[PDB]
Amino acid sequence: PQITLWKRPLVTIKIGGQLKEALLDTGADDTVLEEMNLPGRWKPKMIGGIGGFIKVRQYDQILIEICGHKAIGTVLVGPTPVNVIGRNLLTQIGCTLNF
Amino acid sequence: PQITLWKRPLVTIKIGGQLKEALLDTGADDTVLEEMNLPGRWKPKMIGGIGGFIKVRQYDQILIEICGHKAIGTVLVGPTPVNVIGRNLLTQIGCTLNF
Numbered sequence: 001p002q003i004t005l006w007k008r009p010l011v012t013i014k015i016g017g018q019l020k021e022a023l024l025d026t027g028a029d030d031t032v033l034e035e036m037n038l039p040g041r042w043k044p045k046m047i048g049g050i051g052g053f054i055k056v057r058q059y060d061q062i063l064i065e066i067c068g069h070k071a072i073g074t075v076l077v078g079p080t081p082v083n084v085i086g087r088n089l090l091t092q093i094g095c096t097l098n099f
Numbered sequence: 100p101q102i103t104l105w106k107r108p109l110v111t112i113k114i115g116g117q118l119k120e121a122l123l124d125t126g127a128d129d130t131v132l133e134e135m136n137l138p139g140r141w142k143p144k145m146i147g148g149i150g151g152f153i154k155v156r157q158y159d160q161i162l163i164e165i166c167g168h169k170a171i172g173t174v175l176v177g178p179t180p181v182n183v184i185g186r187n188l189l190t191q192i193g194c195t196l197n198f
């Protein structure tokens with residue numbers, strides 16, 4: 001599909017057996033999701049943006065379905081105000097910017 | 100152009116007659132540039148990101164050319180980690196997401 005940017009580009013995603021809303025975010029290197037109690041091992045990470053850094057948990061090889069398109073890769077979990085789908089998964093669903 | 104997302108979508112912009120590099124950021128409502136001198140009046144404002152809130156100077160109705168496309172809109176100037184072009188200007192240049 002084609003998504004205009006008059007409003008936030010929120011889409012439904014499926015991860016860890018849950019449905020959530022997340023931003024298709026070309027400005028995010030990585031995917032960062034609201035706190036959720038995923039199983040398995042993880043490693044600590046800090047990521048920075050406007051306002052400074054937050055501590056997150058990095059999970060690898062996570063299955064995630066974005067608007068019907070399947071992907072698998074690294075997801076960071078922590079106290080983010082918003083779920084963001086980053087470039088690491090946007091590439092996997094064939095997402096481009098166009099103007 | 101069509102921009103893939105294996106790398107950061109960095110483009111050259113022109114603002115205040117000066118060239119800069121900036122990130123096309125669909126997860127940003129607003130455009131936030133690193134500290135710089137701009138002509139005209141401004142007003143102090145706050146904006147929040149993943150790590151908290153920062154103080155910025157708001158410049159309204161600023162001419163800015165993004166990868167050869169012209170926009171006129173609000174630009175926030177302050178201690179952002181990188182220059183980001185947000186939806187307020189991405190809409191003006193006709194930018195959409197496509198997958």
Ligand SMILES: CC[C@H](C)CN(C[C@@H](O)[C@H](Cc1ccccc1)NC(=O)O[C@H]1CO[C@H]2OCC[C@H]21)S(=O)(=O)c1ccc(OC)cc1
Nearest residue numbers: 027028029030047048049050082126127128129147148149
């Ligand atoms: C360094 C570039 C950029 C600031 C990075 N951000 C992605 C943005 O899309 C961020 C994503 C974001 C969106 C909403 C709330 C928190 C973060 N948007 C944002 O901060 O936008 C601000 C400017 O306009 C306003 O509209 C939203 C907040 C304001 S981020 O969330 O902090 C981020 C995401 C993934 C990362 O992996 C390394 C590292 C940082």
